[PDB]
Amino acid sequence: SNPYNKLFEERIIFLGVQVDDASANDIMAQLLVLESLDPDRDITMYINSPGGGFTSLMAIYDTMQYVRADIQTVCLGQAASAAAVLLAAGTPGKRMALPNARVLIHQPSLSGVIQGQFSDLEIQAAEIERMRTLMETTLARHTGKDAGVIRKDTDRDKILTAEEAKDYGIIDTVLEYRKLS
Amino acid sequence: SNPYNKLFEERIIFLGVQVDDASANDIMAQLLVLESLDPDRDITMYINSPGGGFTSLMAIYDTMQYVRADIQTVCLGQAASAAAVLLAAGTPGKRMALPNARVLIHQPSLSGVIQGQFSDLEIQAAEIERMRTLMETTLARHTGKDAGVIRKDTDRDKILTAEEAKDYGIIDTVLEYRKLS
Amino acid sequence: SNPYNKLFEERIIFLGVQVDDASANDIMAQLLVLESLDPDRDITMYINSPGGGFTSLMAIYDTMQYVRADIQTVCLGQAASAAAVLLAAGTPGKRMALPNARVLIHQPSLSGVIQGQFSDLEIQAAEIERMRTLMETTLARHTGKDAGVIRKDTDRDKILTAEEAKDYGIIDTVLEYRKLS
Amino acid sequence: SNPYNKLFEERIIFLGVQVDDASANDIMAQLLVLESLDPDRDITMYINSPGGGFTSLMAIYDTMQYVRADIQTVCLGQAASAAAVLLAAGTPGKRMALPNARVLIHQPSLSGVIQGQFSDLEIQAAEIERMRTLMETTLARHTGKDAGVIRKDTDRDKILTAEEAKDYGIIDTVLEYRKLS
Amino acid sequence: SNPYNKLFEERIIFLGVQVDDASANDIMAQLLVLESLDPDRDITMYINSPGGGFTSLMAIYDTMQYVRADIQTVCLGQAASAAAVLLAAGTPGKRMALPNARVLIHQPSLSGVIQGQFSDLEIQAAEIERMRTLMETTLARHTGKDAGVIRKDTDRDKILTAEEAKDYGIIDTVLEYRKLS
Amino acid sequence: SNPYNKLFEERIIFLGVQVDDASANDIMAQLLVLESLDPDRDITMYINSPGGGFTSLMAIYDTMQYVRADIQTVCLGQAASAAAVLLAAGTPGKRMALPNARVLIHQPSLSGVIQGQFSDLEIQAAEIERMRTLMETTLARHTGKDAGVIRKDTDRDKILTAEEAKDYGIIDTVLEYRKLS
Amino acid sequence: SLTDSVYERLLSERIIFLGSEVNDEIANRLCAQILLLAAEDASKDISLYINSPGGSISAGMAIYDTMVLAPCDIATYAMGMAASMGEFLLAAGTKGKRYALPHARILMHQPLGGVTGSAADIAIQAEQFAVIKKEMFRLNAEFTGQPIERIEADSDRDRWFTAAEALEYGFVDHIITR
Amino acid sequence: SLTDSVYERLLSERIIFLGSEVNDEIANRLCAQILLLAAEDASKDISLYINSPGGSISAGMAIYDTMVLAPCDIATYAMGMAASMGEFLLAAGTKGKRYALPHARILMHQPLGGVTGSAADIAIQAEQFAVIKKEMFRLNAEFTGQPIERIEADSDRDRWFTAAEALEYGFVDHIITR
Amino acid sequence: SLTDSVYERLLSERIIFLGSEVNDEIANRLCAQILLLAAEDASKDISLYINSPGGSISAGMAIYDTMVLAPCDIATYAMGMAASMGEFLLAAGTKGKRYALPHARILMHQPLGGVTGSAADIAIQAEQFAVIKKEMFRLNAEFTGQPIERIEADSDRDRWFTAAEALEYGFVDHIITR
Amino acid sequence: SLTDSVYERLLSERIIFLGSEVNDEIANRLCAQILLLAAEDASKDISLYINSPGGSISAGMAIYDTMVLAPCDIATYAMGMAASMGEFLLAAGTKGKRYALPHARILMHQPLGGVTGSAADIAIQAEQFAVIKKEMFRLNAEFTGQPIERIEADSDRDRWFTAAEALEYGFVDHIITR
Amino acid sequence: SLTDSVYERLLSERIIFLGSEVNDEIANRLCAQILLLAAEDASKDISLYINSPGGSISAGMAIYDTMVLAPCDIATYAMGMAASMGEFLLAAGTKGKRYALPHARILMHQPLGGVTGSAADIAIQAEQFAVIKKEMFRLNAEFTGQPIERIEADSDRDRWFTAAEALEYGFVDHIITR
């Protein structure tokens, strides 16, 4: 079997560039299946992604918190926007990142049910404020920072290094390199 | 086997973004197969979708009510428009949603047999009133609200939170998070 | 195995949106195979479709009547135009529909051998009258209504509810819901 | 296995809408394989098609006559133009059609090696007369009608019903329906 | 297994419409494999094709002559242009054709390494004369006709019937039909 | 298994029209795998191709010389431009070609890292002179001709016949035909 | 453009052509031409030539009100089709000046309105359409001298009139022969 | 545009060309040109040059009625094809002024009408077509001086006439040579 | 458009260019230009410059009959290709006025007619083509002063004539040098 | 179009530009301009400005013969490229009037002819090409005052001449400086 | 076109704009405009306004030689970018008449030449490019009054000059303020 499938056998979910609502459903399907196979074993989620739709990433967030097995999160590469919520969402003591990892706190982009309401500007601006509120609130619950602080940083597109992400409360540890020579 | 297929083995149907008449047939095929495999075991349907065609979602609704096995419904993410009917349609005591789930009551969009009748405006407006009547009636049967109340909310695009959805009669419980740390 | 294939094992043919001459051949292949596997066992055909080409749906009609095994028909969702003939064509006592099913009697659309004859208007209008005659005649043989009555309704795009379809002779029974709570 | 493959196991070739030179080769491959598997067992060919290229349908015709096993032909739906030759080509006593089957005798369309000869009009008109001669001659050998009679009907796009096709010599029997109720 | 694969098991290569340099490589791969599997058993090549690139058809020609197993050739349908060389190339006593087969002797079309040389007209005209010389020479070696005779016929697009092809030296026998009634 | 895969089992690599950098990697993967499976057994490479990118064909060249197993090369059809280097590169005594094979010595085309440097004309002309130098040098090492001689022929698009290719040092033998009649 | 050159020369002869669609773009072009000709000289007639399958009901009404406010008689001619709004316009020319050529075909029928927007909007557009259509039928009854009941019985069917029948019915006052 | 410039200069010489299609767009352009020339000077003839495969039957009838109402003789010339409606028009020129050039080819045949809309509409369009076609045949019989039975026997076959035959048959009064 | 401006200025000098295709559109444009120039002043010559690969046989015949009926001498020049119908036209200019430039290339050959329609129509188009082509060969024999047998022997082969050979053969009366 | 406006104003100053391609379309446009200017006033010179990569050999010959028959001196200027047929034309201007600007680049080379049609046609086009090319080389030898052997030795190589070299070689009579 | 109308009105004021690309098409348009203005009145100056990223080196040289041969002073203005050939042209205006506006940006840099054709052609185009570029640098050294070594040191780097720096360097004689 190809990797990804070997990774699934090892209870590893790899979250990549496919961040459409359509793929969010695959991540949720993977979490639901790994929990039923063995509720007492950790699930590792690797994150390397340029954010994604906020609505579907919140659906993943609730699934991750719903599931009984601990989920640990590892940031490889990128954890932009909304993926930073999913990174912070892992079980405390198990949020990890590699040294050149970058966590990017951004306002969520407009997506979800934006089908074609007439007052698109009043409605979509309202959806944006709601999404920003959820991102700020959700990160505050998982990082320890007041939502007001998170907003100030979110509004400025603050980008955190793997070490800064610890100080900001997203990462518990920065993974060491293992140099054999 | 990949999830989705593992989910089917566990009697779980995952209803996502594929909400075309063509996919409605797949949901019905899954319900018909799970019932014949074991009529006495519950079927879990996970719902995360931006509505869909009303005509084909009503075809699913009748299949769900036809089937002898209890169907329980879980809203992950979205249950827009017409998917809210399918969410309400699960067996009472078994309609569930995650906290950031949003149930969106909207008038059904125009679809189905809209092949090219000459008087498209008189006919399609008539189809719309019929579809609205079915949505309002169907939700009233499953939520306890008078169809007249549902119409007032439907006409205003009311969006319900997972908790509001209980008060509105769509959800029996809001699923708890399981925080291990 | 995925449903549809499980349905075939159970002798169920699911007729959906794929109503092209190319797919009519698949339905006929399925009927021919199920009959040879066991000529004495019923075949269930589920119908949910926006009509289709008349010529190829008549080819299915003859195959259904040719086959020794009883074919029972269930309307889920739609049975528009020409699919209503196939619905009526099931063995009497075994034509069934769900309550929100709609059977739509329409004149057949122009298809089949319309390759590019010079006098397309005289020829295609002649094909249309022939197709209308077959639809009216075929429904009369299976519904009990005079072909003249069927024509009057066909010309007005009459749409039948699952209950009206019994009165009109297409459906023998309307399937009950099985509410467990 | 899916039908078509089950049909092949039963020595049934299903000739449909795929009537390109590319698919003619598949029909010939199927005839060559069924003969080698068992030269003494009948091959059933089901025909439902809007004609096709004449050149490649004649290649099938010769393969059918070359093969030692009897080939029986059943017209389902259409047997337009050139497919009527293949229908007539089955072993006498075994040419069959369903009641709503239509056999359409038409002049063959222009295809085959029409690569881009300079004098396309003189050459292609010559190819047309040659193809018409082969169709008329081939049907006369299998129907009993003089080629001159066939030409008169061919030139008028005569369409035969399943019963007329017996009188015209293409069909030996029209298949009965089997009504169980 | 599907035909074509059953045909390969029986040591049959079916050469069809796929006559690109890319597919010429598949024919050569098939000849090389059949020879190694059993060098003493005949390979049957069925030919039904609208010529193809001359350069890649000559590559097949050399492979056919290189291979120790006898190769017999059967023309079904077409053997246009360059395919007539491959037809003539089979082992003498084993070149065969069906009665409605047509062998078309044509000048080879321009292909191969025509990448974009500046003097395309002088170079490509030179390639054409070289290709014509090879076709004329190769057919003379396999048909018995002087290359000068072949040129006179080639220049006039002479098309041979299955019987004429014997007189012209391409076919040793014309295959009989096997009429069982 | 299909040929190509049967050819791989027999340690045969078939190099065709797919001469992109992307496919060069497949040829290298095949050489690396065949060597590890059995370092002491010959690898046969069949060549029939319209050159390709020079940079990736040199990557194949080094892999071929790196590998411990003898590689023998057979030219079928074409060995244009850069493929002539790979043909010459086989182990001496084992470079072979069929009689209608043509080896085309051409200057290499522009490819590789041509991403969009500003001074494309000075840089790409420099890459061209470097590539020409490698082709001339590499052929001299494998053909015995001085690189200066090769340049004179390369600049004139000299095309070698299978016999001329022996005199020019690319081919050790021209393969005989095996006529059985 | 020969086509536009010919129409400008004809516009100077006070002749306007309606050759297609009667959509919003065509209605605005015709309204502009009627207003222009009336502005240039209100003492003279305008001749409107119709050969059109028809179009949107609201577009046809814009043309009609412009024809009415313009202070000049408008003659109308059916020179092929005068279908749906093409008929409405034909019939709306002034009395004694509605003409048809012998092979003209007049179709009194209704527009389809057209469905656009969300389900919520479609349900509203349909009411405005029903109102406009009711006025179209009232006006056709007045133009032809028929009971409104006949206008509805005929407009709800695809009933074509020959030029001779169109005259008898009241759409046309005269048939032009030579 | 040289093409449009040449046609405007010719229109001023009272020459109209029908070079293609005879569809609704072409018919409206020709109708506009005939009306314009007759309006400019009704005392003079209009020369119509035809080189066309033909087109829709209703488009050809619109041109024909315009040719008839226009108060001026119209001469017609077959200068290549005069096929289907192209023949109808050719034959519809006035008597003594229908011409063909020696290598002209005249095809009396019928239009196909054309199939559009739903099955319900196609079945109706066919009746209107049959009616128009019957009138086309009556008029060709009158134009050529033939029994209507011959017009049908020949128009239902793809029967081409040489310019010399077209004259004998009555489509053309004179062949132009020099 | 400089291109169209230059051609209008040349048309006023009574010069017509045939630079491509000889399809139905080109033939109608050239026919219109010949008729226009003859109408403007029939006492003067028209000069036709040809540089064309040729085209449809029926298009070339339309141009030819127009050249003949026009009451004015037409001079023709081969100023590159005069191939197929381009040759027919070149050769059809009047006698003493057919010219070629020294590097002109004249190809007497036949058009291919062209295959369109259903098999039933193709079989008919071919007969009309054979008839037109037979007339093309008769006319080339008359234009060049050759037996028709030579016209067929040469037109059925891709036989190019140099300007000097074209003169000897009779396509051209004079070669223009300076 | 400023571009076309500028060229019309220049054409009135008897200046013609060849800025690209020398394909059949460009050759016909230039031939038309040369004929027009000579027709307007044959007592005056025409100045041809060349900045072109070249093109088809037959297109270049059409321009050349037109330049020769036109009864007026033609001056030619290389104001960038004069490549292939661009050189042929440059060199074909009259003597004492062939000019190059100092940074002009002149390429004596051959056209590629171009491959079109079936293998049977390609083999024929190549012979006509070889004949035209042989004449191109003869003419370049005459234009430059070189042995034909040098013209072939240089035209078969991609040999660029600087403006100063082009003068020494005989393509250009003068270099224009100020 | 307002854009072309404005430029024609400006061309009559003897003002030429170079707003983009300096490709072969732009160079031919500018060369035509310079030649036209000088032809209309050689006693007056031409003002060239430059706002361009630059382009092909051979296109810029065609414009430059035309500027030089034209018998009239040419003033040049940098009114945004004068990059690469845009700078070459700016600097090539006559002395005392090279201007920059205060926010102008001047980039002395080299063109890339451009790679086209087969590997065999690319290797040749590069030599012609190297030769043209060497001349570009010699001319910039002469235009600015710099050692050629500085021109190379700066042109081989993406070194932008402010308008004030461009004046000090010698590209510009004056800065225009008001």
Instruction: Find residue E43's DSSP bridge partners.
Output: E71
Tokens of I166: 């074209």
Instruction: Find residue A79's DSSP bridge partners.
Output: A49, A103
Kindly report the backbone phi and psi dihedral angles of residue G75, in degrees, each rounded to the nearest multiple of 5, phi listed first: -95, 145
> What letter does residue A157 receive in the DSSP assignment?
T
Q: Give Cβ neighbours of residue J31 (< 8 Å, ≥ 6 apart).
A: I49, I51, I79, J62, J63, J66
Pairing relation of β-strands C95-97 and C173-174?
A: parallel
Of A103, A53, A45, A108, residue with least CA distance to A79: A103
Distance between CA H156 and CA H23 in Å, rounded? 21
Active site residue: A49, A56, A106, A142, which one? A106
What is the 3-class SS of chain B, one letter each residue? Answer: CCCCHHHHHCCEEEECCCCCHHHHHHHHHHHHHHHHHCCCCCEEEEEEECCCCHHHHHHHHHHHHHCCCCEEEEEEEEEECCHHHHHHCCCCCCEEECCCCEEECCCCCCCCCCCCCCCHHHHHHHHHHHHHHHHHHHHHHHHCCCHHHHHHHHCCCCEEEHHHHHHCCCCCEECCCCCCC
3-state secondary structure of I5: helix
Resolution attained, angstroms: 3.1
Q: Please check whether residue D39 is in contact with residue E149, taking contact to mean a CB–CB distance below 8 angstroms.
A: no
E to C contact (≥3 Cβ pairs closer than 8 Å): no
Total domains, chain B: 1
Of G100, G36, G23, G109, residue with least CA distance to G66: G36
Q: Give Cβ neighbours of residue I35 (< 8 Å, ≥ 6 apart).
A: H10, H15, H49, I66, I70
Distance between CA C162 and CA D178 in Å, rounded? 27
Q: Which residue, among E114, E121, E133, E135, would best test binding to J if mutated, counting the most J CBs under 10 Å from its CB?
A: E121
DSSP for I70-139, please give it. Answer: SSS-EEEEEEEEEETHHHHHHHTSPTT-EEE-TT-EEE---------S-HHHHHHHHHHHHHHHHHHHHH
Element (H, E) at H105: strand H105-107
Is A45 buried (19+), middle (13-18) or exposed (0-12) by CB count in 10 A? buried
Q: Give Cβ neighbours of residue F63 (< 8 Å, ≥ 6 apart).
A: F27, F28, F31, F32
Q: Chain K: which residues have CB within 8 Å of chain E?
A: 118, 121
- Compare all CA atoms of chain K with the CA of E115 and give the residue at the minimum distance: K118
Chains that touch J (3 or more CB pairs under 8 A): D, E, I, K
Q: Give Cβ neighbours of residue K79 (< 8 Å, ≥ 6 apart).
A: K49, K50, K51, K101, K104
Q: In 10 A of CB A68, how many CB atoms?
A: 10
Of I145, I175, I160, residue with least CA distance to I78: I175
Q: What Å distances lie between residue J72 and G165, I101, J15, J75, K127, CA to CA?
A: 72, 17, 13, 10, 39
Listed by number, the residues of chain C in 26-85 with a beta carbon closer than 8 Å to a beta carbon of chain D are: 26, 28-30, 32-33, 36-37, 55-56, 58-59, 61-63, 65-68, 70
Of G103, G3, G12, residue with least CA distance to H63: G103
Taking the CA of residue K150 and the nearest CA in chain E, the distance in Å comes to 41
Active site residue: D49, D106, D111, D142, which one? D106
Question: Which residues in chain D have Cβ-Cβ distances shorter than 8 Å to C32?
Answer: 3, 7, 12, 46
Distance between CA B166 and CA B176 in Å, rounded? 14
CATH number at residue G147: 3.90.226.10
> What letter does residue E103 receive in the DSSP assignment?
E
Instruction: Find residue G74's DSSP bridge partners.
Output: G46
Pairing relation of β-strands B71-80 and B102-104?
A: parallel
Tokens of F107: 């200057």
G to D contact (≥3 Cβ pairs closer than 8 Å): no
Q: Give Cβ neighbours of residue F52 (< 8 Å, ≥ 6 apart).
A: F19, F20, F24, F81, F82, F83
DSSP for J35-104, please give it. Answer: HHHHHH-TTS-EEEEEEE----HHHHHHHHHHHHHSSS-EEEEEEEEEETHHHHHHHTSPTT-EEE-TT-
User: What residues of G are annotated to the active site?
Assistant: 84, 109
What is the 3-class SS of chain G, one letter each residue? Answer: CHHHHHHHHHHCCCEEEECCCCCHHHHHHHHHHHHHHHHHCCCCCEEEEEEECCCCHHHHHHHHHHHHHCCCCEEEEEEEEEECHHHHHHHCCCCCCEEECCCCEEECCCCCCCCCCCHHHHHHHHHHHHHHHHHHHHHHHHHHCCCHHHHHHHHCCCCEEEHHHHHHHCCCCEECCC
Tokens of I31: 């026919």
Instruction: Tell me the one-letter amino acid at D155.
Output: D
Of G48, G43, G44, G40, residue with least CA distance to G67: G48
Tokens of D155: 């030139």
- Compare all CA atoms of chain H with the CA of I72 and give the residue at the minimum distance: H178
Note whether C119 contacts I: Cβ–Cβ < 8 A.
no
CATH number at residue B78: 3.90.226.10
Note whether A116 contacts G: Cβ–Cβ < 8 A.
yes
Instruction: Tell me the one-letter amino acid at A2.
Output: N
Of C170, D3, C76, residue with least CA distance to B32: C76
Taking the CA of residue H75 and the nearest CA in chain G, the distance in Å comes to 16
Distance between CA I72 and CA I36 in Å, rounded? 12
Distance between CA E85 and CA E73 in Å, rounded? 11
Q: Please check whether residue C59 is in contact with residue D48, taking contact to mean a CB–CB distance below 8 angstroms.
A: yes
Q: Give Cβ neighbours of residue E48 (< 8 Å, ≥ 6 apart).
A: D21, D24, D25, D28, D56, D59, E14, E15, E16, E17, E75, E76, E77, E78, E79
In whole angstroms, what separates CA B42 from the centre of its chain? 17
Burial state string for K135-165 with b = 16 or more CB within 10 A and e = fewer than 16: ebbebbbebbebeeeebbebbeeeeebebee
D to C contact (≥3 Cβ pairs closer than 8 Å): yes
Active site residue: F106, F111, F119, F181, which one? F106
Note whether C118 contacts I: Cβ–Cβ < 8 A.
yes
Instruction: Tell me the one-letter amino acid at E2.
Output: N
Helices B120-143, B54-66: inter-axial angle, 10-degree rounding: 30
Distance between CA K66 and CA H39 in Å, rounded? 56
Taking the CA of residue H178 and the nearest CA in chain G, the distance in Å comes to 31
Tokens of H106: 């005249």
Active site residue: D1, D36, D49, D81, which one? D81
- Compare all CA atoms of chain C with the CA of B111 and give the residue at the minimum distance: C50
Tokens of H60: 């050809």
> What letter does residue I42 receive in the DSSP assignment?
T
Q: Please check whether residue B27 is in contact with residue B60, taking contact to mean a CB–CB distance below 8 angstroms.
A: yes
Distance between CA E147 and CA C29 in Å, rounded? 53
Is A177 buried (19+), middle (13-18) or exposed (0-12) by CB count in 10 A? exposed
Number of B/H CB contacts below 8 angstroms equals 4
Range of the domain at A11: 1-181
Instruction: Tell me the one-letter amino acid at A110.
Output: L
Pairing relation of β-strands F102-104 and F71-80?
A: parallel
Pairing relation of β-strands H46-52 and H15-18?
A: parallel
Question: Which residues in chain G have Cβ-Cβ distances shorter than 8 Å to B116?
Answer: none
Question: Which residues in chain B have Cβ-Cβ distances shorter than 8 Å to A57?
Answer: none
- Compare all CA atoms of chain B with the CA of A138 and give the residue at the minimum distance: B100
Element (H, E) at A67: none
3-state secondary structure of J15: strand
> What letter does residue H1 receive in the DSSP assignment?
-
Is G93 buried (19+), middle (13-18) or exposed (0-12) by CB count in 10 A? buried
Taking the CA of residue B129 and the nearest CA in chain H, the distance in Å comes to 25
Distance between CA G59 and CA G18 in Å, rounded? 12
Q: Which of I81, I102, I162 sits opposite J65 (nearest CB)?
A: I102
Instruction: Find residue I83's DSSP bridge partners.
Output: I107
Q: Please check whether residue B159 is in contact with residue B168, taking contact to mean a CB–CB distance below 8 angstroms.
A: no
Tokens of C62: 């003859």
Tokens of D160: 């035969």
Torsional sign, CA I68, I71, I75, I78: negative
Distance between CA B58 and CA B24 in Å, rounded? 9
In whole angstroms, what separates CA G70 from the centre of its chain? 15
Distance between CA J142 and CA J128 in Å, rounded? 22
Distance between CA J92 and CA F52 in Å, rounded? 43
Instruction: Tell me the one-letter amino acid at D141.
Output: R
Q: Chain J: which residues have CB within 8 Å of chain I?
A: 1, 4, 7-8, 11, 24-25, 27-29, 31-33, 35-36, 39, 58-59, 61-62, 64-66, 68-71, 121, 124, 128, 131-132, 135
In whole angstroms, what separates CA G39 from the centre of its chain? 21
DSSP for A24-36, please give it. Answer: HHHHHHHHHHHHH
3-state secondary structure of H150: helix
Cβ of J105 within 8 Å of Cβ of K58? The answer is yes
Q: In 10 A of CB C70, how many CB atoms?
A: 17
Q: In 10 A of CB D59, how many CB atoms?
A: 26
Roughly how many angstroms between the first and final C-alpha of chain A, as a whole number? Answer: 32
Question: Which residues in chain G have Cβ-Cβ distances shorter than 8 Å to A116?
Answer: 118
Q: Please check whether residue F95 is in contact with residue F27, taking contact to mean a CB–CB distance below 8 angstroms.
A: no
Q: Please check whether residue G33 is in contact with residue G62, taking contact to mean a CB–CB distance below 8 angstroms.
A: no
Chains that touch D (3 or more CB pairs under 8 A): C, E, I, J
Q: What Å distances lie between residue E111 and E20, F108, J118, CA to CA?
A: 10, 20, 11
Tokens of D178: 């089997």
> What letter does residue E95 receive in the DSSP assignment?
E
> What letter does residue D110 receive in the DSSP assignment?
S
Instruction: Find residue D152's DSSP bridge partners.
Output: none
Number of E/J CB contacts below 8 angstroms equals 44
Question: Which residues in chain C have Cβ-Cβ distances shorter than 8 Å to I121?
Answer: 118
CA dihedral of A57, A62, A64, A68, whole degrees rounded to 10: -170
Of J97, J106, J70, J85, residue with least CA distance to J18: J85
Listed by number, the residues of chain D in 133-162 with a beta carbon closer than 8 Å to a beta carbon of chain E are: 134
Q: Which of J4, J69, J135 sits opposite I176 (nearest CB)?
A: J69
Chains that touch B (3 or more CB pairs under 8 A): A, C, G, H
3-state secondary structure of F76: strand
3-state secondary structure of E24: helix
Give catalytic status of residue C106 as yes or no: yes
Question: Which residues in chain F have Cβ-Cβ distances shorter than 8 Å to K130?
Answer: 122
In whole angstroms, what separates CA A61 from the centre of its chain? 7
Q: How many helices (H) and strands (E) does chain H have?
A: 7, 7
Listed by number, the residues of chain C in 94-123 with a beta carbon closer than 8 Å to a beta carbon of chain B are: 98-101, 104
Is K76 buried (19+), middle (13-18) or exposed (0-12) by CB count in 10 A? buried
Of F89, F171, F92, residue with least CA distance to F137: F89
3-state secondary structure of C90: coil
Distance between CA F84 and CA F90 in Å, rounded? 10
Note whether B173 contacts C: Cβ–Cβ < 8 A.
no
Q: In 10 A of CB B1, how many CB atoms?
A: 10
Of I78, I99, I98, I96, residue with least CA distance to I160: I78
Pairing relation of β-strands G98-100 and B173-174?
A: unpaired
Range of the domain at H137: 1-178
Of G168, C123, D130, F126, residue with least CA distance to E161: D130
Q: What Å distances lie between residue A4 and A15, A175, I178, CA to CA?
A: 10, 22, 82
Note whether B14 contacts A: Cβ–Cβ < 8 A.
yes
Note whether B16 contacts A: Cβ–Cβ < 8 A.
yes
Distance between CA A72 and CA D162 in Å, rounded? 71
Distance between CA A3 and CA B126 in Å, rounded? 54
Q: Which of J110, J114, J120 sits opposite E120 (nearest CB)?
A: J114
Total domains, chain I: 1
Of H41, H144, H40, H52, residue with least CA distance to H93: H144
Q: Give Cβ neighbours of residue C6 (< 8 Å, ≥ 6 apart).
A: B33, B36, B37
Taking the CA of residue J74 and the nearest CA in chain I, the distance in Å comes to 13
Of D48, D54, D4, D58, residue with least CA distance to D28: D58
Q: What Å distances lie between residue F143 and F20, F87, F157, F165, F166, CA to CA?
A: 26, 10, 17, 9, 9
Can you tell me which residue has the tokens 């076709």?
E135
Q: Please check whether residue E123 is in contact with residue F156, taking contact to mean a CB–CB distance below 8 angstroms.
A: no
Tokens of D111: 């295809």
Q: Please check whether residue D49 is in contact with residue D17, taking contact to mean a CB–CB distance below 8 angstroms.
A: yes
> For A135-142, which contacts have Cβ atoms below 8 Å and span 24 or more sequence positions?
A135/A54, A135/A82, A135/A85, A135/A107, A135/A108, A138/A58, A138/A61, A138/A85, A138/A88, A138/A89, A139/A84, A139/A85, A139/A88, A139/A105, A139/A169, A139/A170, A142/A85, A142/A88, A142/A89, A142/A92, A142/A169, A142/A170
Kindly report the backbone phi and psi dihedral angles of residue A115, in degrees, each rounded to the nearest multiple of 5, phi listed first: -60, -30
Q: Give Cβ neighbours of residue K51 (< 8 Å, ≥ 6 apart).
A: K17, K18, K19, K78, K79, K80, K81, K82, K86
Taking the CA of residue I117 and the nearest CA in chain C, the distance in Å comes to 9
* Ranges of H-type helices in chain F: 5-9, 21-37, 54-66, 83-88, 120-143, 147-154, 162-167
Give catalytic status of residue C49 as yes or no: no
Tokens of G114: 């057209």
Q: What Å distances lie between residue D172 and D41, E21, F11, K119, CA to CA?
A: 20, 47, 57, 70
Distance between CA G121 and CA A114 in Å, rounded? 17
Q: Which residue, among H56, H84, H110, H122, would best test binding to C if mutated, counting the most C CBs under 10 Å from its CB?
A: H122
Q: Give Cβ neighbours of residue I146 (< 8 Å, ≥ 6 apart).
A: I140, I169, I170
Note whether E115 contacts J: Cβ–Cβ < 8 A.
no
> What letter does residue E96 receive in the DSSP assignment?
E
User: What residues of I are annotated to the active site?
Assistant: 84, 109
Distance between CA I136 and CA I65 in Å, rounded? 12
Note whether F170 contacts E: Cβ–Cβ < 8 A.
no
Instruction: Tell me the one-letter amino acid at C136.
Output: E
